[PDB]
Every structure is written in structure tokens, then in C-alpha cells.
Amino acid sequence: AQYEDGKQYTTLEKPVAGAPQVLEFFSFFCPHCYQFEEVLHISDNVKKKLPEGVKMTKYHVNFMGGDLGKDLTQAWAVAMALGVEDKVTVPLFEGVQKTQTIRSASDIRDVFINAGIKGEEYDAAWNSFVVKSLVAQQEKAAADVQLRGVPAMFVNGKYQLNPQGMDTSNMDVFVQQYADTVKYLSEK
Structure with missing residues (x-):
């Protein structure tokens, strides 16, 4: 074929029911995630090629940066x-x-303050039980697929993107191949 299991993607031996359609995992400590976000804009270019009716989900993980x-x-x-x-x-x-x-929660907070969210509003959110369950969601989804590395994308809880098996000579071509793969897997 042109899209082979084990080549541009892999399949989960135990599939995750009820999963978000396009599910992405990252960490702010993860260097490729930095590249994925700042240089490549993976998420963005994936959204542009996705079918209509597709929701995109992005979660942070705990296993980097203690x-x-x-x-x-x-x-x-x-x-x-x-x-x-x-x-x-x-x-x-x-x-x-x-x-x-x-270097601390306080430094994280400053970024929000300087991006214009109000102190009161951030602290209230920070402490809210709406936020507790959202944290729980992020952890549960990662747990469901046994996540050990980021960046990582999952389509319909069955397929996992495999960027190692795509061309990296040309960044633009890498992104296209990546996104087109998501679209293909999406249609599967």
C-alpha cells in the first residue's frame, strides 16, 4: 500500500473506545513539541485538512519536568x-x-497575567473543581493509551501517528505527510 501499519502509523493492540476523534499529547518540557508547535504548526495544519465534523483535542502530560x-x-x-x-x-x-x-507555579501564572487573564480569574479557575476534572481527563486519556512519549497523536483511539517513518529533509513536506496521514486515518 502507500499507508502501511507500522510505517506512518501503528495500531493499538487494545483500542480505546469513546476516545476523542483527534487526540494530541504534548509537554512544555518536550523539545519536539516545541518544534511541533512553533516551527511546524502541526495541530494547525492537521485541522485544515480534517473532514468537517471533526473535533480536535490537545492534552498536557505529567511525566516530564517533575x-x-x-x-x-x-x-x-x-x-x-x-x-x-x-x-x-x-x-x-x-x-x-x-x-x-x-521555575514555579508563580512563574506559570505570570504568563497568563501578561497574556491578559485577570489574576482573580486565573486563581479562581486554578482552584476550581471544573479544572480538577479537566486535569483528571488529561490523565485518564494518557492512561488509556499507556503514554510514555510525546509528541503523540491518536486517531479514534485506534491509530497512533508515527512521524519517525516520514521524510524530514523538508519541514513543509513532513507536515503535509503528517496531516494527510491524519486525514487518511480519520477516514478509516
Whole structure:
């Protein structure tokens, strides 16, 4: 074929029922995630090729950056609750990996403040039980597929993207191949 199991994707030996249709996992400590977000814009170019009717989900994971990782998972939950993902994603990445200015929950908070979410509103979200369940969701979905590495994408809880098995000479071509694969798997 042109799309082979084990080549552009792999299949989960035990499939995950009820899964979000397109499910992406990342960490702000994850270097490829940084590339995936800042240079490649994977999520974005995937959305542009997806069928209509497709919802896209993105979750943070705990297994990188220890105690700050868990904090970042709770903060990503706040972003999701407030719908401010597109306003904090880049400064979180650059604060963890470029400038090294995020070293505590308080430093994470500053990024939201400086992106214009109000202190009161952030702290309230931070502490809210809506946010607790969103954190639980992020952890559950990762658990369901036994996640051990990021970046990682899952389609319909059955298929897992395999970027190692695509051409990387040309970034633009990599992205197209990646997204087209998502679309193919989506139609499966």
C-alpha cells in the first residue's frame, strides 16, 4: 500500500473506545513539541485538512519536568477552561525551553497575567473543581493509551501517528505527510 501499519502509523493492540476523534499529547518540557508547535504548526495544519465534523483535542502530560510538569498540566487545564490556549501556548513553551524563566507555579501564572487573564480569574479557575476534572481527563486519556512519549497523536483511539517513518529533509513536506496521514486515518 502507500499507508502501511507500522510505517506512518501503528495500531493499538487494545483500542480505546469513546476516545476523542483527534487526540494530541504534548509537554512544555518536550523539545519536539516545541518544534511541533512553533516551527511546524502541526495541530494547525492537521485541522485544515480534517473532514468537517471533526473535533480536535490537545492534552498536557505529567511525566516530564517533575513537579513543574504537574503544575503545567493544571495550568493547561485552566487554559482549556478559559479558552485561552492560543494566548498562552507560545509563552509557556518559550518560558520553559527558550528563556528559562518558568521555575514555579508563580512563574506559570505570570504568563497568563501578561497574556491578559485577570489574576482573580486565573486563581479562581486554578482552584476550581471544573479544572480538577479537566486535569483528571488529561490523565485518564494518557492512561488509556499507556503514554510514555510525546509528541503523540491518536486517531479514534485506534491509530497512533508515527512521524519517525516520514521524510524530514523538508519541514513543509513532513507536515503535509503528517496531516494527510491524519486525514487518511480519520477516514478509516
